[PDB]
């Protein structure tokens, strides 16, 4: 984690959420990482790549995973944009 020598003396890089930005802990058992599989523009079929989203345990339990992943997606190449 960037010591004075500059090297990585740290256990692991922790994740962060995409909505509430707080750090997902190492035992936070209600934090999901889901995938949104996009298609090609010609036919609407699965191509091989996808996109990623993480929703932490508290902000799932607070109610607004979907109010998150509608909006985060809305500005990120998923449906309507208006």
């Amino acid at each position: 984690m960037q010591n004075d020598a500059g090297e990585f003396v740290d256990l692991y890089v922790p994740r962060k959420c995409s909505a509430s930005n707080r750090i997902i802990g190492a035992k936070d058992h209600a934090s999901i990482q889901m995938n949104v599989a996009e298609v090609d523009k010609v036919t609407g079929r699965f191509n091989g790549q996808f996109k990623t989203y993480a929703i932490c345990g508290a902000i799932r339990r607070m109610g607004e995973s979907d109010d998150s992943i509608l909006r985060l997606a809305k500005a990120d190449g998923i449906v309507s944009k208006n």
């Binding site: 058992h29 209600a30 934090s31 999901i32 889901m34 995938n35 949104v36 599989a37 996009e38 298609v39 523009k41 010609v42 036919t43 609407g44 079929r45 699965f46 996808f50 929703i55 345990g57 799932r60 339990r61 109610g63 607004e64 995973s65 979907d66 109010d67 992943i69 509608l70 997606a73 190449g77 998923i78 449906v79 309507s80 944009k81």
Partner: protein, 221 residues
Amino acid sequence: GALDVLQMKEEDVLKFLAAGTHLGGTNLDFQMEQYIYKRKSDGIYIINLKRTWEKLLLAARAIVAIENPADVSVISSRNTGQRAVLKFAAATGATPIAGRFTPGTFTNQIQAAFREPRLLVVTDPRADHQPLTEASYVNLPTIALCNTDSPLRYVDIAIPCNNKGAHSVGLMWWMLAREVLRMRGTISREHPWEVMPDLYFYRDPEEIEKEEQAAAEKAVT
């Protein structure tokens, strides 16, 4: 859903209207005002169908992201949507949990019926909460075809259609099983998938043998 291939496809709107699907309850939540158009004069609240279609295409963009076809645990408790939840898993290759769900199934790894999925679809969040608060532990993404009635605690891709009526549920599994194979290479978008939405609808009680063979005296008899 921002495509031309993935548009509304006007055929199904004549089925979205005729099987409920804009007939909610009469009580919106605080986390579902964005999924509504207005209230009727008789208290009923309609649902701007562009909103429930853009969530339906988005949820199928979550099901295709699963690699294993035999891993999405599709579940149902209430009676409307017990016939559909079986042969939805026969049309996509899933495993169905119809009716009563044993608590201690996602997280009790000692007994026989211990199943651990990567995704689960629900009919109703409120009345079928027991897999939801058990999906609290096994950090699993959940989808639920929610009504304006239901809360939205452990849902992720909440589908805002309807869940009360028999016909309103079965279309929404038929629309989903149409779409979850059409984002795969099963139906090629122009040769339309003939499989009838009456296959999924909830079944009336036992006058069926009275009426199936009353229109079959010209087939066998």
